[PDB]
Amino acid sequence: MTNIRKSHPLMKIVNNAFIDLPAPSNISSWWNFGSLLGICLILQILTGLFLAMHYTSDTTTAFSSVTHICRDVNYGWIIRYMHANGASMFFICLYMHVGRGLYYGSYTFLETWNIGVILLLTVMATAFMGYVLPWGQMSFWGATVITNLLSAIPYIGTNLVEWIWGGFSVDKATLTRFFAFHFILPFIIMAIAMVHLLFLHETGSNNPTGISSDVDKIPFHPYYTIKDILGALLLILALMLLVLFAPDLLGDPDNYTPANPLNTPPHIKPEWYFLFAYAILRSIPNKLGGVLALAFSILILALIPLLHTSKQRSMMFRPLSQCLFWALVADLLTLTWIGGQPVEHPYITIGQLASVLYFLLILVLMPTAGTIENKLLKW
Amino acid sequence: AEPEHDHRKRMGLKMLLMMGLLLPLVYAMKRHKWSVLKSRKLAYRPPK
Amino acid sequence: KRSVLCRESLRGQAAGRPLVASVSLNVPASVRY
Amino acid sequence: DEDAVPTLSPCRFTGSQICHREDGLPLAHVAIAVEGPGWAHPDNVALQVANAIIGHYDCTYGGGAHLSSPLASIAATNKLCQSFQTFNICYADTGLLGAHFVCDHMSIDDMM
Amino acid sequence: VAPTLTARLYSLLFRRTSTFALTIVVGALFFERAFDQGADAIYEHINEGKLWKHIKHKYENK
Amino acid sequence: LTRFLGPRYRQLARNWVPTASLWGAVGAVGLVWATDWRLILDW
Amino acid sequence: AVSASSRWLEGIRKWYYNAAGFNKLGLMRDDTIHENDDVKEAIRRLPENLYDDRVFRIKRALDLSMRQQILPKEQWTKYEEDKSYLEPYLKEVIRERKEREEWAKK
Ligand code: HEM
Ligand code: HEM
Asked: Which residues, in sequence order, are CB contacts of B31 under 8 Å at separation 6+?
């Protein structure tokens, strides 16, 4: 070759994973969440760096600082609310991503699914720490209750919770730590995302039908670059629709109250992206049992590849699993509802059944349904 | 509470107007780019 | 390869001065008789 | 005259592709074209002069790497293709313009 | 015959990408101003007299 | 340096100026929105 | 002792196959298979005819998926025509690998 810009620079060749790569033809709109997921990481990042251009990480100021970012600083208001709302998007998008590989057998790519899982739980920590930075009532108490949930571990726990906090409570110590970790996790995450993409470039993307598309492969550049741009268009639409017309709507917490350590919102709860886990945690009487169960809710994901029973990696051609699949999402929705509910009889009893129904759907129902379907097809 | 929001609402109106023109435009571009895939005909013709 | 099924192919070699003359050129290249 | 009359009507120009994949075959033939002038047109000699430049090339050209038309040189140099020719097909109301290259399965894009 | 509006537009401005981008630069300018103007006006209309712009009179120069 | 200079090259340069010329105009437009010169606004 | 049950079992099977997208898609149950290592080797063992056919049907399929259109009622895959053409091939491959595994015990 001569003057083929792409392969000339070795570096520029590496970028032809966007332009020349084999892309399946058929391909639901669902896939656009991978790309969108990465737009969200970049958005969050630029926003973060501008917010962290005018934020301070101290008990005294933090609150003020954020408050100053939203009032005297020029266009810091939208930057901050874009930031907050963004993260909602980032999660909404992540849970579409996981649903699509729960449905279509994308998780077949073991390697790629274990990086995903790492990705998902990294992004979870970042969102957990970033919400406390502001240092508002909700934040303050939420980080106490969660962190302390770690003190359920029998031998260490207790010592360990105090290490993490850098003291006996959540004072300055802890709030600067979160600022530092929040800032450096998304930069570590970016390398994982690229390691994720790496593996996934070795086998290409699955489809609705669940079958190899090597017989029908499209250039990513011509087609997918427009689709992606279009998906951004809608993505930003939702971000701005949220951030411009209903700033607070999706940010349940109304606690714009500076944290007072004796004071408590009797209604303490993580934002929407964590509710599922929360509800599953309350269903167990015992503290430790809850924490394990909390972990398993999320960590349960890596086990699905082993759980797969069918011969059709595609759910598309399998009724019964489509039916339980959907239920689990609606069970998931049910559990998110419990998260903002008084922890009283009515919700208790519901949540408990929901929590068992979630684990059933993942651990026992679906697996069986997989077999059945195989035996009906005579497979 | 939200001094910026009152100003922000006007931007939202502009954004809404901008989004519709943009949302519609993006779809048209996508169709033109994705038009070729839909248009193509696939058939099998073995001598058999 | 071109199929030689019918009555059409007669190819056999025999010219006046030249016989089996092979020519190689950058612009072109071939085999005659 | 009527029979002639049916003749000479314009034939609608369409830019589409027809892709008939047979991995069984050893090489790949690609004919890429942009519609052109009828038989008579000032633009129609100037085109030729254009294709003179790109030229045409085969496994057996004696110049290979030193041939003055880039597609040829690149081809010659990088084992890009087996043979390639530019054409100008001239019809009264229609014209096919482009080139045509035969090239291994893995080199279709580079020669394009 | 004449070129459809688009064909006219095309051959004047979109054959050469140099002209195309020139266009876009120009367009982006002109557009911003009319959008704003029109978009602003729309918004102010919906809150007549609610905004300082409307209310400055009261305590201004006597 | 010396190798790049040539008698033959001029058509490309002429062509480049228009595309380059067109490109140059875009920056002025791009800069101007950010710059917000009162005079530029006046224009 | 399956007489009523067999017929009943058969009846259940037609509904699932008809119900499944595969019947609607026009790709036979065998083309819906998760392509894994054993399926992969069975695939490779297919005849030109059998094999090229799978390529077209998946070609036509992924084309419909892409356009979200279903094939005409007249042209669908009918359960009664269950070409389990992969099955034969697929069986052995597994058969051979089971053996290999077993031979490796001790
Ligand atoms: C995708 C990963 C990220 C997620 C999920 C995320 C999420 C969040 C959330 C949920 C908050 C709380 C805001 C509120 O409700 O008031 C926040 C605040 C903050 N984040 Fe991020 N963020 C991410 C990346 C970053 C990065 C890369 C930076 C800096 C480079 C950053 C800097 C900040 C700062 C300085 C604040 C505090 C000011 C404020 O409250 O907005 N974040 N982040
Ligand atoms: C920071 C978050 C993430 C980013 C930035 C990201 C990025 C991407 C991108 C760009 C692609 C290719 C297009 C697509 O298939 O949508 C993709 C595919 C994939 N991702 Fe994600 N990813 C993220 C999180 C995850 C998570 C949480 C999981 C699952 C645990 C995961 C698993 C996968 C899988 C299995 C595929 C391949 C599916 C297929 O195309 O057949 N990813 N990822």
From this structure: none
